[PDB]
Design a protein around this nucleic acid. Sequence first.
DNA 1: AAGTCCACCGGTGGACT
DNA 2: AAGTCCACCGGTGGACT
Lengths: 332, 338
Amino acid sequence: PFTYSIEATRNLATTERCIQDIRRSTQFQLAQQNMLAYTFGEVIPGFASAGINGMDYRDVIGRPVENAVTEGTHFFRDDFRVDSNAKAKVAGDIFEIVSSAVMWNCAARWNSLMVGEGWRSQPRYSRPTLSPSPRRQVAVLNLPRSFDWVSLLVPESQEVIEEFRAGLRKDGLGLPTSTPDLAVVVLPEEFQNDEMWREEIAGLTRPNQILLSGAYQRLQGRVQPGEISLAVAFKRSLRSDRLYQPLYEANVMQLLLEGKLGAPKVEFEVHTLAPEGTNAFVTYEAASLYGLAEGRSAVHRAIRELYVPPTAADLARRFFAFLNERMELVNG
Amino acid sequence: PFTYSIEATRNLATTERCIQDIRNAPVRNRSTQFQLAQQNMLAYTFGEVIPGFASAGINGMDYRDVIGRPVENAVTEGTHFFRDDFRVDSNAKAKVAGDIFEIVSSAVMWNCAARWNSLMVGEGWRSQPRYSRPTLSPSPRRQVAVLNLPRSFDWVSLLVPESQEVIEEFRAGLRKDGLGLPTSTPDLAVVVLPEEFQNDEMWREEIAGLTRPNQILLSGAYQRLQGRVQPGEISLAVAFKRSLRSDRLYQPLYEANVMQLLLEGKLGAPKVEFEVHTLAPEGTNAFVTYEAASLYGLAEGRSAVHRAIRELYVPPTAADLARRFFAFLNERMELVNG
DNA sequence: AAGTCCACCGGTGGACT
DNA sequence: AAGTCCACCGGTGGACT
Ligand SMILES: [Ca+2]
Ligand SMILES: [Ca+2]
Ligand SMILES: [Ca+2]
Ligand SMILES: [Ca+2]
Ligand SMILES: [Ca+2]
Ligand SMILES: [Ca+2]
């Protein structure tokens, strides 16, 4: 009608409406795997030029989205547009994938020394002092979406845990396990002469991406409860509500690995580039609840540290020093 | 030059640039252009309506639609006044939709508590709308307070000082070892009404709408109760999450665990009831996650281990939300002597 | 008072069917 | 393949200063 009317409008057939609709809604996809291959095809931060190794880690992790934005602008001009939720999702995966690659190369360089091939000198990092041994080799495992960390355990340990859950599921309870982003594990005895674990990679090409992202498959059902040496959760920035998955999961890991399988203190740390204030530091001082609730065990922190890598080299240095220390707990 | 050059462009004086910014845009930390004024939206949309205590049409409507109505009205106003210029980020809608889900639902529970309290002090059972009359023996010591808790809150501050000292002395022990056990907060706490307030009419009045004074009454209520609740008088804790993601399940799971360690473990309280409300579970993932046993209960090793989170609840309508809460009170408040 | 903190969640790329 | 599931985080309104 001349004066607008909701009733009249609601009564029109679809094809009689004044506006005809002729249209996920995403327009330009951030191809994150392509982005890694492009920006980090030939660079693993902390193992490249002193410039990249020493650079503000936030700038490094941010480079691929920046390069992708520049690419998009070139090809699509003033039509180019991506949602902040895209950038957010990709930036996070990139933070995780890249740091896990730094750690992979530290692991390779450390394995190469454990096995008696000496200590690679480029770039220069202080030579670990621990006495070398094939049995002190480690694997860095970037764990996939949907993983259950329990699947790393030798089958006998899964049974122990499974039985324990049975008792619970019978009464409507359970104790699901999810997953940290990453786990470093002592390399299984059977793999200790395999060459692959000692080779540093040149960059995140697609083949190398697959290598790092699928390495967990090779160790599934092979790790002793005590041989899970470090768990890491990466969160590129924090918010107060986003802190708890790693805190909770570390608690569950300590309960099962320390409590039910008698393993040493489980080391679980969080990495972020933007703690956005200081409360997360207080939050992650929380004592491990299992250790508290029962009396037999010395109580320690669920999360050992909230770490803010300044540079890629500092991340590399910190892992090395951790290995140099944590691996002493393993007979050579 | 004919072929675009980044350096030539850099060298351009600002008055020589090809694009001339003429916005006169005030430079700020944030790039927001229109704010969703959430307290204003609550007032406009629910000024005269508390869902579950309004019209048959509202009480029985899909609760997703009720909760989504303030943002929808807001978008209407916005496109009316600002036409093509009106844009807000999905992140603004997420923030405001979240707070609205929690504030609205907490207001439904406030009205329930009032109607409940009215019955408990012997003033009978209201009928508009119609809810099943409670079978539990009325008593003024079975009144409850619904507390929408503030951002930054620490739930331990509700507890009577005698109980807070136990906790602090426990934490002091932990600190000598370089440990802590911080506590955060659930969105909402239902607590037994302290004696001193059991004759206060303000706990028996139902509110007509979320006008700004009512918003403030509800959101400020916790202050009145700070330091006056016994450990075992914390009857229900609720976290509201309008939708779920697998990574966003854990604050309430963790906090419920901490509440149970301290309240049940250290203060002898009975099972701590703690539940999540969502309108969008996105699968069965979270229902499995929340079957998790209370970690405290386990590790120590006594019988009758229970879940940390009692239930993941998905409110079909506001009416159902009220019914459930009434049903809960009816069963839970029998643990309290008349 | 501009700035900082707090806690809100929805749109995303890739794995999987 | 057409769809669902997973787990990523940054922009936000209001409190507090
Ligand atoms: Ca991963
Ligand atoms: Ca899974
Ligand atoms: Ca992560
Ligand atoms: Ca609140
Ligand atoms: Ca606080
Ligand atoms: Ca909430």
